[PDB]
Amino acid sequence: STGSATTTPIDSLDDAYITPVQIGTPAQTLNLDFDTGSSDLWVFSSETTASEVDGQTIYTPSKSTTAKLLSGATWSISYGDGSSSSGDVYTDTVSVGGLTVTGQAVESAKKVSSSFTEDSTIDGLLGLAFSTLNTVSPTQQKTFFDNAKASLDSPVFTADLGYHAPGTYNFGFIDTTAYTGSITYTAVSTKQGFWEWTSTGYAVGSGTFKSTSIDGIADTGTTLLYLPATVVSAYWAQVSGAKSSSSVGGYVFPCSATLPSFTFGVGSARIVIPGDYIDFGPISTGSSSCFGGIQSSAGIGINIFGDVALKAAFVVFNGATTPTLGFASK
Numbered sequence: 481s482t483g484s485a486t487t488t489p490i491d492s493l494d495d496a497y498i499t500p501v502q503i504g505t506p507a508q509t510l511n512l513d514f515d516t517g518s519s520d521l522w523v524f525s526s527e528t529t530a531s532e533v534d535g536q537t538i539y540t541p542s543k544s545t546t547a548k549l550l551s552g553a554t555w556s557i558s559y560g561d562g563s564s565s566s567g568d569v570y571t572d573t574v575s576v577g578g579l580t581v582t583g584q585a586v587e588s589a590k591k592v593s594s595s596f597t598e599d600s601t602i603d604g605l606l607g608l609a610f611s612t613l614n615t616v617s618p619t620q621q622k623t624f625f626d627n628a629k630a631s632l633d634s635p636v637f638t639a640d641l642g643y644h645a646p647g648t649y650n651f652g653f654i655d656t657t658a659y660t661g662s663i664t665y666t667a668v669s670t671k672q673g674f675w676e677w678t679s680t681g682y683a684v685g686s687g688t689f690k691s692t693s694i695d696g697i698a699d700t701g702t703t704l705l706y707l708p709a710t711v712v713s714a715y716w717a718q719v720s721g722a723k724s725s726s727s728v729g730g731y732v733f734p735c736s737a738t739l740p741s742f743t744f745g746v747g748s749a750r751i752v753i754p755g756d757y758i759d760f761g762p763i764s765t766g767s768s769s770c771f772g773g774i775q776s777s778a779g780i781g782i783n784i785f786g787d788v789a790l791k792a793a794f795v796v797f798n799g800a801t802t803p804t805l806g807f808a809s810k
C-alpha cells in the first residue's frame with residue numbers, strides 16, 4: 481500500500497506545516513503537524529480542558545464507532561520550544577492520504593500548553609521519529625509509520641516541504657518526479673530515537689565548502705536550522721548589520737538585507753538553501769529587525785536540520801531494518 485498527502489504551511493513564514501489526517505469512523509479530519517522529531521500522535525479532543533481549546537478541530541472518540549479506550553494508558557510530552565501536552569489514549573483507525581492503519585494509538589489531550597492553545601491551525605501532532613521515544617505509559621505505543629510499515633510497498637516515507645507553498649508527505653514509495661538529480665543516502669543513528677545523521681560540511685553563499693562533520697537530526701517539527709555556533713557565526717558574518725541578540729533570542733538582521741544562501745553537505749552531495757528561506761521576517765510587527773532562520777544549537781544539546789534545511793530538499797526517511805536518510809535537490 482501507499483499514502484500521499486499534501487502538507488501546507490500554517491502561516492506566511494512556514495513556521496510549521498499541517499497535514500490532514502482522518503481519524504475514526506466516520507472519519508474526523510484533523511490537521512496535524514507531522515513531526516519527524518517526536519513519536520506521539522496526539523490530538524486536541526473532546527477531553528481537552530475547554531479553556532485550552534481556541535479554534536482547533538477536536539477529535540471526539542465517543543462519536544467514532546472504532547474508537548476504543550486504551551485502558552490505563554496515559555501520555556505526557558514536552559517539546560524543544562518548551563511547549564507540552566498530556567492526556568489519555570484511544571486506539572482508532574487513522575488514515576493519511578489514503579493509507580490506513582487500524583488500531584493506531586491516538587493520544588487524546590486533556591491538557592495542552594498555551595502555545596498550542598494560541599495556535600488555532602494545529603489540531604495535534606503526528607510523530608514520525610522512532611517509536612522508542614513514544615511517551616505512552618505503561619505500554620509504549622508505535623508511531624503511525626511503524627504500524628503502517630509492513631503494509632507499505634517500500635518501508636519509507638518522504639518529506640517534500642514547500643517554501644511558502646504546499647508540499648507533500650508520501651508513504652511507501654519514492655516519487656521520482658519530485659526531485660532533480662539523484663538521491664544521496666547517508667547513515668542514521670537511532671540511539672537517541674531520532675533521524676540522526678552526519679552532514680559532511682557547509683558553505684556560505686558562494687564561499688568555499690568547509691568539510692566538517694556535523695551530527696544532527698532531520699526534524700520536520702522544528703522550524704529553523706540549528707547548527708554549531710562557529711557555523712552560524714560564519715553565516716551571519718556575511719550579512720551586514722546582523723548580530724546575535726540576547727533580548728530577541730538569536731540572530732537578527734536588517735530586514736533590508738539580501739541573505740546569502742547556505743549549503744550543507746550530504747556525503748559528496750550538496751543541498752543549497754536559498755537566502756530567502758533564511759528570512760523569518762520582522763521580530764515584531766512593523767520592526768525593521770528581521771529574525772534569522774539559521775540559529776545556534778549551543779545550549780540545545782543537538783544540531784537540528786529543521787524545516788529551513790529540509791524544505792530545500794526532497795528527503796527520504798528510509799525505515800528499512802537499518803534506517804537511512806536520503807536527500808535530493810528539487
Ligand SMILES: O=c1[nH]c2ccc(NCc3ccccn3)cc2[nH]1
Pocket residue numbers: 495496561563595596597599602701702703704
Ligand atoms: O521549532 C519550532 N516549531 C514550531 C512550530 C510552530 C510554532 N508556532 C506555533 C505553535 C507553537 C507551539 C505549539 C503550537 N503552535 C513554532 C515553532 N517552533
